[PDB]
Amino acid sequence: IEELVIWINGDKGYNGLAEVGKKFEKDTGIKVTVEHPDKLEEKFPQVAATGDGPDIIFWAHDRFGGYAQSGLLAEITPAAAFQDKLYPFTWDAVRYNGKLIAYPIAVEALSLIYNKDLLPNPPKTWEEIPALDKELKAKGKSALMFNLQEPYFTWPLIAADGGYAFKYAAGKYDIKDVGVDNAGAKAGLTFLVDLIKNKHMNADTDYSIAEAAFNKGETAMTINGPWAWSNIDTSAVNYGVTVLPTFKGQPSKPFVGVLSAGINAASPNKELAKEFLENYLLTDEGLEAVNKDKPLGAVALKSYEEELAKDPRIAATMENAQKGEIMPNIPQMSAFWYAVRTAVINAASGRQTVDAALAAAQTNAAAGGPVEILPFLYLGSAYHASRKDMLDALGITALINVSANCPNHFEGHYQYKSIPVEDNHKADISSWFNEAIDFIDSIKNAGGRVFVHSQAGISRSATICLAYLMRTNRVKLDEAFEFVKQRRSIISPNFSFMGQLLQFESQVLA
């Protein structure tokens, strides 16, 4: 509670931020205390859901979307002037549903890292790479090794000619508009898959293999971000950091992570918070104090980034950032990571063509439809619960809303039953089983149809369906589970929910 307490992770320059916080006090009187709690990003939503947390939270923007989806952050109101002191692409990283929710501070992205002794003139284009590797292989070396397992590393190439994760426009992401199987993504993944099938790269290279091969001088280039610079410094490689290669004449598009500071919406110093960040933190003076403690990398303040860019490594980070795509802060990003990962493995190994693999990934990452469990019982996501015509076309007359923050979007048009549980181990979801089972039977007897939903339609809403099949058929959990899973393959109640379902099993069979 109280009246400014600032949370930052310990990896960073919190002492230097303490300084810009004494220099605050000697100007305001009001005190700022900078604590760096352990498991910080996990503790914040636990404690700010009630209150007694910090006023200002610092973290990568991608997790701030989950925070804002829970309302835990206040809509910052920066002067139209102050926004021009930051690079314009950074403001796109700190919005949810259109509203600003944080101030951008620092920026990271992958770059091309090359061995100055093996390769003083690194190639500017992906297309140059096969010739260069043909030359280096005759000397026992290779041109390029980087992590091929994670889509985060392969996507900059796949995106260059037109691929994208989720379309972004007017401050919002459209989770139906996935750019995984368009012509641009096919061409980049075809180039990638060709580098592997022509043995210029190996399908098995992961983060470790790549990082060791480069720091031992076995390979002329790798791809990696600033977190990796410390290990190369330790080694005997004279290295450079530069702009990623182009593909078909267009830049590589790495994902961009924006270190950010958010305001607790459950805090009164919302003005004292805006005061400290807008006018004492993001100044050349302010960031330098933080920078001197532990470096920020590339920064979002134009004035101070000009200074740091004297380090060509930081200049390369910012340049790759400005050509990249902001990392989507929406929960659907997880299914995207996994879907593309499968596509790259299956295309790189010949199990699938590039076209079949990207097409299946498109389907996995893009939103689908509700699923019929029983004629009167459907299962699906929060997205679906906002498409009235689509539910009307299915004959849905009632919804079970298993969430803590999802509105009933069409009250008065459908009967709503709320089950307000989070998807975590603490949540007593089985104490709602009876009430939810009666609602479904009630609607069924009146000739209607129930749509049961939770954020992803994976854990909370599936658990409600499984419990219904169990009490209503007097069958075991593993039979209910097999039934739903064959209709909606992604369902997965969380570990505590599987336990609560098993307890429920022995009650309904007693």
Binding site: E150, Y338, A456, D478, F481, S496, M498
Partner: protein, 92 residues
């Protein structure tokens, strides 16, 4: 970082439905890799992956009455496969 509890929740003579406490892994985690093999056996383990949003998986085609070592690894969206996996021994 990595999950901390791993159990069998259903079983047939040739198959196991396992569950792990995924909620304890950070948001950085985008898949889990499951390995299984005869405990004390010679053969390399078999393995598959599942999405980071899963807390459940089916292991099938097992021999009846055999002790298996079952391991769950976390997968990070940047580094990939992480260390300190969780494992149990369980007999079909």
């Amino acid at each position: 970082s990595v999950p901390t509890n791993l159990e069998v929740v259903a079983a047939t003579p040739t198959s196991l439905l396992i569950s792990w406490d995924a909620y304890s892994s950070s948001y950085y985690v985008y898949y889990y890799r499951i390995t299984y093999g005869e405990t004390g056996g010679n053969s390399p383990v078999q393995e598959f992956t599942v999405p980071g949003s899963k807390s459940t998986a089916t292991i099938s085609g097992l021999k009846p009455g055999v002790d298996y070592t079952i391991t769950v690894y976390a997968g990070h969206y940047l580094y990939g496969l992480l260390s300190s996996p969780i494992s149990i021994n369980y007999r079909t």
